[PDB]
Design a protein around this ligand. Sequence first.
Ligand SMILES: [Mg+2]
Ligand SMILES: [Mg+2]
Ligand SMILES: [Mg+2]
Ligand SMILES: [Mg+2]
Ligand SMILES: [Mg+2]
Ligand SMILES: [Mg+2]
Ligand SMILES: [Mg+2]
Ligand SMILES: [Mg+2]
Ligand SMILES: [Mg+2]
Ligand SMILES: [Mg+2]
Ligand SMILES: [Mg+2]
Length: 180
Amino acid sequence: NYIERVVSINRVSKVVKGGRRFSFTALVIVGDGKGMVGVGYGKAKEVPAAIAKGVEEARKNFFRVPLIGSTITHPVQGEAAAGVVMLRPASPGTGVIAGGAARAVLECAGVHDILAKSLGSDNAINVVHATVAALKLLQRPEEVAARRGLPIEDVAPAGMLKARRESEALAAAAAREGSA
RNA sequence: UUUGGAGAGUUUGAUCCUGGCUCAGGACGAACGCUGGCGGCGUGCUUAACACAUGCAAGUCGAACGGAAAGGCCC
Ligand SMILES: [Mg+2]
Ligand SMILES: [Mg+2]
Ligand SMILES: [Mg+2]
Ligand SMILES: [Mg+2]
Ligand SMILES: [Mg+2]
Ligand SMILES: [Mg+2]
Ligand SMILES: [Mg+2]
Ligand SMILES: [Mg+2]
Ligand SMILES: [Mg+2]
Ligand SMILES: [Mg+2]
Ligand SMILES: [Mg+2]
């Protein structure tokens, strides 16, 4: 089960000595809803071929989201492409607050609570690149502590330890219910 | 040690950037246009600090005095 979405459809054109040659380009985002993200950019002369190319490229290119239970770990300032997209977690149930392309990519990621803002070049392609880079910039507390050579309690806050323990207990309960 | 950030259209044969405009949101001591049933609770000259017909919005003491004009009683 994968989540599919389309963000923008553009009628690109090419010129020859005879006249105008039209073409179609599409960008799609694929995700499993658990924290696995794939982006695809596909070009054709017709929408079905375009979306097929986009889906294939997205299937080729994947990326994993290290989310804590339901939300993001820490605020991230994703500076890439030409747009500035700033992501940070929030209180559970607040919702994934983001623009169009960011909305699509985060919903395909499966996150449920995020605060986002795009600060320039509202173009969908650049926004998607900036969000992907923002997720790449994300760091996870366990291997952050491993890199720093200091144990978890001496690195990460007790509140996020409590949240992680609650998330682990909920995941264990869900696994038990699914097995039974 | 806890609470809360959305964008989209629009320059080009085509796109990327910058950059400008516009729209989706809430609010008013508001008004005009159609329509219109009641009840409760608020609000009411933002301009002309312009002139204002009439009547109201500042009175109380005989246990302060002299008195009795108008009411009472008694000859
Ligand atoms: Mg910078
Ligand atoms: Mg901008
Ligand atoms: Mg914009
Ligand atoms: Mg709050
Ligand atoms: Mg234009
Ligand atoms: Mg130009
Ligand atoms: Mg044009
Ligand atoms: Mg009424
Ligand atoms: Mg009233
Ligand atoms: Mg008078
Ligand atoms: Mg007096």
